[PDB]
Design a protein around this ligand. Sequence first.
Ligand code: NAG
Ligand code: NAG
Ligand code: NAG
Ligand code: NAG
Ligand code: NAG
Ligand code: NAG
Ligand code: NAG
Ligand code: NAG
Ligand code: NAG
Ligand code: NAG
Ligand code: NAG
Ligand code: NAG
Lengths: 50, 420, 198, 84
Amino acid sequence: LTGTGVLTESNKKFLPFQQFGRDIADTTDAVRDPQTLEILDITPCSFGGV
Amino acid sequence: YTMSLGAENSVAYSNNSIAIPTNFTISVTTEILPVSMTKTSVDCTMYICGDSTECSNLLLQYGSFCTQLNRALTGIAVEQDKNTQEVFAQVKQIYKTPPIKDFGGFNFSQILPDPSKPSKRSFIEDLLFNKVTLFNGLTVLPPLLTDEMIAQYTSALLAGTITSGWTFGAGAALQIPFAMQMAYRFNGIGVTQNVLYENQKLIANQFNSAIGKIQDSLSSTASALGKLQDVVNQNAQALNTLVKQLSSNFGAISSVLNDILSRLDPPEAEVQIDRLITGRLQSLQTYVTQQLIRAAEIRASANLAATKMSECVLGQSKRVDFCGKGYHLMSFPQSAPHGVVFLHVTYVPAQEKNFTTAPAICHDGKAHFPREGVFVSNGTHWFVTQRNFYEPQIITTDNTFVSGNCDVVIGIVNNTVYDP
Amino acid sequence: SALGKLQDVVNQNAQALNTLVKQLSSNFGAISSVLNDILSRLDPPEAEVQIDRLITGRLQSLQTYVTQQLIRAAEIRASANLAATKMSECVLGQSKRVDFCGKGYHLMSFPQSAPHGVVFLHVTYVPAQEKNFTTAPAICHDGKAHFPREGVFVSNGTHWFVTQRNFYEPQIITTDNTFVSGNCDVVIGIVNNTVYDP
Amino acid sequence: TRAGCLIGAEHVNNSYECDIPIGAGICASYSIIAYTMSLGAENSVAYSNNSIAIPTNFTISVTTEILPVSMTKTSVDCTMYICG
Ligand SMILES: *[C@@H]1O[C@H](CO)[C@@H](O)[C@H](O)[C@H]1NC(C)=O
Ligand SMILES: *[C@@H]1O[C@H](CO)[C@@H](O)[C@H](O)[C@H]1NC(C)=O
Ligand SMILES: *[C@@H]1O[C@H](CO)[C@@H](O)[C@H](O)[C@H]1NC(C)=O
Ligand SMILES: *[C@@H]1O[C@H](CO)[C@@H](O)[C@H](O)[C@H]1NC(C)=O
Ligand SMILES: *[C@@H]1O[C@H](CO)[C@@H](O)[C@H](O)[C@H]1NC(C)=O
Ligand SMILES: *[C@@H]1O[C@H](CO)[C@@H](O)[C@H](O)[C@H]1NC(C)=O
Ligand SMILES: *[C@@H]1O[C@H](CO)[C@@H](O)[C@H](O)[C@H]1NC(C)=O
Ligand SMILES: *[C@@H]1O[C@H](CO)[C@@H](O)[C@H](O)[C@H]1NC(C)=O
Ligand SMILES: *[C@@H]1O[C@H](CO)[C@@H](O)[C@H](O)[C@H]1NC(C)=O
Ligand SMILES: *[C@@H]1O[C@H](CO)[C@@H](O)[C@H](O)[C@H]1NC(C)=O
Ligand SMILES: *[C@@H]1O[C@H](CO)[C@@H](O)[C@H](O)[C@H]1NC(C)=O
Ligand SMILES: *[C@@H]1O[C@H](CO)[C@@H](O)[C@H](O)[C@H]1NC(C)=O
């Protein structure tokens, strides 16, 4: 699964089998790294009109 | 079942019968009007594809659609700011209530602000704000006027209404005791001011109880703020439909562009990208057109709210059913998340009574007609009373005028007119 | 910039029509944005494909313009209905509605034409040079209460007069400009003074 | 600001009847200064229970209200436009 964003620590508690999380409107918001099994949030880096 | 249109009552019509109320109720009724909606902006190029150069290049060739969509949305946002301005920026000066509150027994403590720092908003306003409960190129711009400043406009309008009457809406704010302002408003609806001055404690109790009752209804009974909630729900649902529509093929291999780029050659890549872009433009244009029509609806509502604030908070309206059932006495504005709540204080006649009338009185061969009332009789004696309240008075020359002989008017009754 | 509304609507229409005409130079994916080159440069089948793409693009363009124009026409029709209402209730008569025919107590109004609109000159009465006075709900004379027929009871400190509400025109309190209602023990704020009988 | 960040404007404590709107009540004017907008002049009416204010003079004020009535009657021939 590919994307662009900034990764942050998370307090979310995935179930053991669950890989990545989605919010309403079916957007990826968290993921486990396959290496050390930690939940990390994905948020789009800043955009906005000038 | 088949619906019932209401209770069937037939009034006791007669050619010499009238019913004149002997009492009244001061009814405070609420109306809720949306004023503005959420200010939203979707940048088209980031929405369609975003962080894909090939897509940006071959969206450049579809024209200036993105620019049109952007300008329409910006016009909508500016329009919401102007809607709030028109509804609330009605007074150029921020009035404040005096520290000592001697309003003739009337209690505005339930609609005036409190120093308990609840964002400087009244307790009814606090209930209203608690009742309404509420990334991909998509942003929400904050309103120009914050909730606190809409609260300050509302507080200024209340202070002016309760300390100056209708005067501050037509020129210099001119102080007047509130009991006298209410007497003026009673004369407006055709009831002589002695009715207020003699029933002042009763009227104040009725008004205070009505404000407390609307408080209780708002705190306990739900489904009162459904208009504002409906506006919010429609906007949020349209916006989620737009974002959800971004996960659709529109006839292509994949909804995401990265997989199309990775897994197709540039000819077929541009064909599939063409179909994703055409689908996503149709979705965006559908969204913007729907939002423009909803903007028109909210603009009509905000213009109506501005009219109501001008004609019912800053004055007293003779337009029946414009500011509540009953004869309008006054109105109070209260802010809401995206709208205004009017508490209309009206005069509803009550405790009606059977009487017998007459078009005129024949005395000394002359026909006498009332100046500002109506001839009534309890069965034996004739009186002149005002139309909206039973206050019988002896028929005299000061309250009756002569307009000819007695053999032209149908139904003239047969009586004496006292000369003082 | 006192006629920004009319200039705004004319700018909006001109801008929409300019962006309509400018879309005619967008190829929408076709080989060229001009039909003659596609015709005189491609064989009839591929020509038909390119022509179809241009047709779809230009129908989207024209339909967007027409939808926008319909919404703008709804806006202008609301403005025209409000203008008709104002010319009825402000020009053909005096209006009791507040802020409808201008700031202040409305006296009259005069229409003026403009290139695509109307300019209402609202003549209103704005009170000024206010003075404080001491009031009373009623006057108790001969044990009976006296309320103004039309006006308000004021005092300059020592004498009581009756004036109209919107202009300081004092008058001696008489039985001509006052009516009696009950005794003088029910009204709160009643004051003692003589009521002249002519 | 709640509306983003301003680069090039000096924040001032003073509150003015503002000119260029920014958002969240911040709105700037002319160095370029940004500030929280003042709703208006604060005045307190001298309310009392035996006090009235009666005007002793008046002004006849003439105001202007502009109302759009019509817009340009434009016709587009669809087939001529789209095909030429
Ligand atoms: C009022 O009520 C009484 C008793 O119900 C009735 O006799 C009388 O006719 C009514 N009034 C008139 C004017 O008919
Ligand atoms: C009118 O109604 C009020 C309460 O609604 C009541 O207290 C009063 O006795 C009634 N009658 C009069 C004459 O006020
Ligand atoms: C108004 O009502 C509140 C509670 O409803 C009470 O605390 C306050 O004293 C009342 N004010 C007056 C003047 O009676
Ligand atoms: C009608 O009014 C007169 C005048 O006060 C009063 O004397 C009388 O008792 C009233 N009732 C009847 C039935 O006449
Ligand atoms: C009312 O009608 C009755 C009969 O219908 C008639 O006797 C009486 O004169 C009428 N009264 C008036 C005032 O017209
Ligand atoms: C009313 O009184 C006058 C006195 O001249 C008389 O002409 C007339 O007949 C009376 N009306 C009736 C209905 O008796
Ligand atoms: C007269 O009224 C004004 C309000 O316009 C107030 O500022 C002033 O204090 C009043 N004068 C007195 C003597 O109270
Ligand atoms: C009030 O007006 C009367 C009218 O003649 C005048 O005699 C009196 O001096 C006035 N009082 C004051 C305090 O100006
Ligand atoms: C006006 O209010 C004051 C309270 O400071 C009170 O002493 C006075 O009796 C009141 N006057 C009237 C006429 O109600
Ligand atoms: C008004 O006059 C009556 C009778 O002379 C008197 O009892 C009352 O006290 C007077 N009012 C005042 C405020 O002095
Ligand atoms: C603004 O007010 C703050 C205190 O809230 C103060 O520290 C600062 O110096 C003030 N700035 C100006 C320009 O007055
Ligand atoms: C009312 O104001 C005008 C100027 O606005 C002035 O000429 C006139 O003298 C004033 N009237 C009075 C009675 O002072």
